[PDB]
Amino acid sequence: GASRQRKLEALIRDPRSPINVESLLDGLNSLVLDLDFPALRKNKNIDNFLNRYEKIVKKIRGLQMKAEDYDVVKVIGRGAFGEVQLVRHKASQKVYAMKLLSKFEMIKRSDSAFFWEERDIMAFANSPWVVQLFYAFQDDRYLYMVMEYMPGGDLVNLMSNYDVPEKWAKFYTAEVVLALDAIHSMGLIHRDVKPDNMLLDKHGHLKLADFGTCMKMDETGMVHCDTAVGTPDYISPEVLKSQGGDGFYGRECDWWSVGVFLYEMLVGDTPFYADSLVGTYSKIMDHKNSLCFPEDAEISKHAKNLICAFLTDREVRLGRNGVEEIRQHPFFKNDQWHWDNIRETAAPVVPELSSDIDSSNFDDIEDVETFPIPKAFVGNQLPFIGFTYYR
Amino acid sequence: GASRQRKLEALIRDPRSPINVESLLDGLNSLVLDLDFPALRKNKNIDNFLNRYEKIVKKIRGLQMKAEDYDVVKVIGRGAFGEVQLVRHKASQKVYAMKLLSKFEMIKRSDSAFFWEERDIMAFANSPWVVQLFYAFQDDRYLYMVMEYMPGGDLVNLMSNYDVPEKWAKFYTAEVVLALDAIHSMGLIHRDVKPDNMLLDKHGHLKLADFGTCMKMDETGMVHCDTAVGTPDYISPEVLKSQGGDGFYGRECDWWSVGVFLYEMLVGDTPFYADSLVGTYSKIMDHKNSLCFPEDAEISKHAKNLICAFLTDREVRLGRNGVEEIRQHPFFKNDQWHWDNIRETAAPVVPELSSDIDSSNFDDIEDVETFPIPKAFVGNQLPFIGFTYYR
Ligand SMILES: c1cc(Nc2ccc(O[C@@H]3CCCNC3)cc2)c2cc[nH]c2n1
Numbered sequence: 211g212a213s214r215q216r217k218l219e220a221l222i223r224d225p226r227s228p229i230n231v232e233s234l235l236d237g238l239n240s241l242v243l244d245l246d247f248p249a250l251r252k253n254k255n256i257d258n259f260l261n262r263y264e265k266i267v268k269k270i271r272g273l274q275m276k277a278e279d280y281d282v283v284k285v286i287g288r289g290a291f292g293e294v295q296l297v298r299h300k301a302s303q304k305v306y307a308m309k310l311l312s313k314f315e316m317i318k319r320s321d322s323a324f325f326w327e328e329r330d331i332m333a334f335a336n337s338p339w340v341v342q343l344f345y346a347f348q349d350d351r352y353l354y355m356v357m358e359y360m361p362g363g364d365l366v367n368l369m370s371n372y373d374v375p376e377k378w379a380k381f382y383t384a385e386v387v388l389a390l391d392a393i394h395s396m397g398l399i400h401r402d403v404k405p406d407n408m409l410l411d412k413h414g415h416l417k418l419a420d421f422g423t424c425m426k427m428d429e430t431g432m433v434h435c436d437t438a439v440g441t442p443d444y445i446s447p448e449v450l451k452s453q454g455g456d457g458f459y460g461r462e463c464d465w466w467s468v469g470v471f472l473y474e475m476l477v478g479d480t481p482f483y484a485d486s487l488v489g490t491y492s493k494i495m496d497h498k499n500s501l502c503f504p505e506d507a508e509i510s511k512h513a514k515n516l517i518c519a520f521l522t523d524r525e526v527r528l529g530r531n532g533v534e535e536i537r538q539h540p541f542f543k544n545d546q547w548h549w550d551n552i553r554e555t556a557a558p559v560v561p562e563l564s565s566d567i568d569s570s571n572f573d574d575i576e577d578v579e580t581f582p583i584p585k586a587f588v589g590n591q592l593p594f595i596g597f598t599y600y601r
Numbered sequence: 602g603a604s605r606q607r608k609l610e611a612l613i614r615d616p617r618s619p620i621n622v623e624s625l626l627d628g629l630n631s632l633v634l635d636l637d638f639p640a641l642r643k644n645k646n647i648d649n650f651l652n653r654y655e656k657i658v659k660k661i662r663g664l665q666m667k668a669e670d671y672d673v674v675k676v677i678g679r680g681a682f683g684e685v686q687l688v689r690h691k692a693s694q695k696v697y698a699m700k701l702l703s704k705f706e707m708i709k710r711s712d713s714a715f716f717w718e719e720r721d722i723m724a725f726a727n728s729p730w731v732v733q734l735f736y737a738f739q740d741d742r743y744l745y746m747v748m749e750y751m752p753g754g755d756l757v758n759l760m761s762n763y764d765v766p767e768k769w770a771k772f773y774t775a776e777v778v779l780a781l782d783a784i785h786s787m788g789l790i791h792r793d794v795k796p797d798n799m800l801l802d803k804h805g806h807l808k809l810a811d812f813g814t815c816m817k818m819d820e821t822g823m824v825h826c827d828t829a830v831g832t833p834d835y836i837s838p839e840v841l842k843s844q845g846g847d848g849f850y851g852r853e854c855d856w857w858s859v860g861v862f863l864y865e866m867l868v869g870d871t872p873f874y875a876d877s878l879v880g881t882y883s884k885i886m887d888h889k890n891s892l893c894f895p896e897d898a899e900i901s902k903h904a905k906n907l908i909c910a911f912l913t914d915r916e917v918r919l920g921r922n923g924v925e926e927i928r929q930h931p932f933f934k935n936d937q938w939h940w941d942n943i944r945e946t947a948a949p950v951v952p953e954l955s956s957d958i959d960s961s962n963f964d965d966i967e968d969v970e971t972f973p974i975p976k977a978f979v980g981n982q983l984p985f986i987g988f989t990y991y992r
């Protein structure tokens with residue numbers, strides 16, 4: 211009573227709330243995009259609705275942040291859903307990394323929610339371990355995520371250029387343990403921990419940048435999933451088994467992937483490599499027999515024990531009793547950093563970068579059809595309402 | 602560039618703009634109402650859109666102004682689209698008159714725009730001659746217009762209780778000429794000028810309250826209409842002829858109705874009364890022969906000339922050269938008011954009202970099916986997006 215208008219206005223001012231101005235503005239743009247067809251305009255309700263909102267919706271699109279406000283400098287990445295571009299804001303002259311997700315393929319492959327957790331993690335984590343999202347916007351064909359540009363590349367590139375000693379492996383693994391703990395702290399399970407999603411900032415420190423497979427845990431820190439997700443080499447046995455139905459696992463699947471990552475860093479090969487994907491899946495499931503260290507692998511007993519501690523069945527895997535039993539594993543005993551200050555210390559490898567558009571740590575890329583015209587209302591832009599966000 | 606966000610925000614703060622917060626909030630509520638059905642939720646896009654907006658939309662409806670915030674004191678009117686109720690705001694203890702328009706019958710009879718001009722005239726006219734709209738809101742079944750309560754009743758009630766002398770007729774006609782000039786000033790043609798739409802305020806002064814038939818004039822002060830509108834007794838010949846197609850008329854149709862009103866006031870009968878509606882239409886068209894004054898009608902030559910000046914074909918009707926030739930007709934020569942101060946002078950009849958809920962000048966009323974469940978998206982709440990307005 212009386213303060214109900216002030217309470218309602220408070221919901222529209224909250225960027226966490228799904229009814230903020232940009233989300234309400236999306237609700238209108240999506241409706242105009244999904245009704246503006248010759249076929250649907252046969253409806254007297256639709257045609258009169260469009261006649262009074264067509265002009266203003268087209269003015270609003272042009273007034274809002276658009277793809278045209280950035281100069282594409284170079285395409286540095288290219289997933290199945292779209293490319294990651296090194297862009298420069300025309301007005302601010304600032305260099306960001308912008309991810310494009312095809313609205314066609316994201317809707318077409320049924321995948322229309324994986325980006326929500328990515329959006330919320332980047333926009334609101336406020337963690338030094340998570341790449342920050344400055345602006346999320348969209349157009350009829352793509353979603354756009356303007357994020358901080360990580361100029362040092364990924365850990366795949368590092369491993370390809372260096373024989374990683376255990377002094378460096380201790381470091382990168384610790385930064386990954388803390389980044390995952392920050393994600394788990396936010397009530398999420400990564401599910402796609404791999405060196406490809408571990409980026410290095412301008413000083414050589416780690417940040418996790420891809421969050422497509424993230425999934426919110428229930429009040430028991432558990433997840434119910436009947437679909438295998440992640441990269442073949444790093445999928446834990448519990449996530450593989452989940453494909454057959456009755457999938458019930460927790461955050462320990464991320465610690466499995468850490469162990470695969472640490473093995474790859476020290477050995478130079480994935481622990482369960484095979485030519486077929488099914489050959490890799492067989493080795494992962496049969497880990498008790500298939501996990502072995504090459505006789506030329508220069509690895510300590512502590513490093514081997516930590517890898518074996520992670521590469522076991524979830525029931526007895528390190529990390530089941532919290533992150534503290536990971537942090538106090540003798541492998542992390544070092545005279546360069548502490549868990550409370552590791553990000554303030556010198557990184558093993560500091561990227562050499564001549565300019566704000568230097569993308570030397572990213573391999574060159576050598577350069578998504580249109581949605582069909584609907585006979586009846588389909589509402590293809592409906593899963594995208596509320597994607598827009600401005601920091 | 603840069604100020605584009607401030608320019609965009611300025612559109613959402615403007616109550617005249619169709620993309621203000623309440624209009625954007627309507628766009629969401631209408632979408633949720635028109636998609637929440639078992640049949641439509643078979644669509645993967647629709648079902649997932651609803652799952653993330655159902656809870657918050659139902660919280661927003663309850664937070665916003667609702668029909669339940671008013672105490673219905675008495676039903677005082679009852680048109681074909683809905684009733685006018687004398688209500689009292691539960692929190693403010695303030696008495697308003699609230700008009701309910703059936704969303705079912707307004708959509709069902711194809712009439713889904715007549716209320717727009719009424720809403721804008723009342724909400725934004727700021728004229729002492731137009732009843733003010735304080736809040737416009739809506740629910741799944743009705744539109745709601747919370748307006749100032751006119752406690753003196755209409756001119757039909759006055760004429761039924763009094764033998765109106767020409768001293769009073771000069772007054773009520775002048776107030777009607779100024780009220781229509783204010784509407785014409787706003788670029789509108791009333792089209793339904795009748796004593797039923799002329800209400801008396803707490804002091805006995807006039808205000809026009811129904812604007813359903815209003816129509817915006819083009820840059821030539823003309824309108825293109827192929828449909829007869831208004832009340833049979835007061836329809837001008839040009840509006841009757843418009844029914845046969847090729848309707849092109851201006852604001853002079855309102856001056857015709859003024860003359861019918863003045864005749865009714867002085868003679869006590871409508872100038873073209875007949876038992877059939879077609880008998881009335883014949884008399885209106887044949888006005889040159891059918892208009893006559895009873896030999897017992899106590900009317901002056903100036904009053905008869907003004908009525909005849911209004912009841913002619915549009916081509917030569919008084920008001921074609923502006924409102925000044927109406928204002929200087931000798932019939933208005935009086936020693937009580939001037940055109941510039943008529944509303945500050947004493948009204949002929951001041952209503953006797955014991956309390957803020959006294960509705961003695963309104964006859965007692967002796968007390969709209971549901972929309973069908975749609976197989977495919979119909980968007981029945983779409984013509985109502987942007988009706989909500991809070992002063
Ligand atoms: C920079 C890059 C980014 N993405 C990104 C792009 C390409 C990547 O690697 C390619 C493909 C995988 C194997 N190695 C080469 C990795 C990450 C982001 C995301 C946010 N900020 C960023 N700044």
Ligand SMILES: c1cc(Nc2ccc(O[C@@H]3CCCNC3)cc2)c2cc[nH]c2n1
Nearest residue numbers: 677678685698732748749750751797810
């Ligand atoms: C009071 C009344 C109002 N409507 C209204 C209701 C009933 C009317 O008359 C009945 C039917 C026609 C013949 N005579 C009796 C006229 C106008 C409004 C509108 C805004 N404020 C109001 N305050």
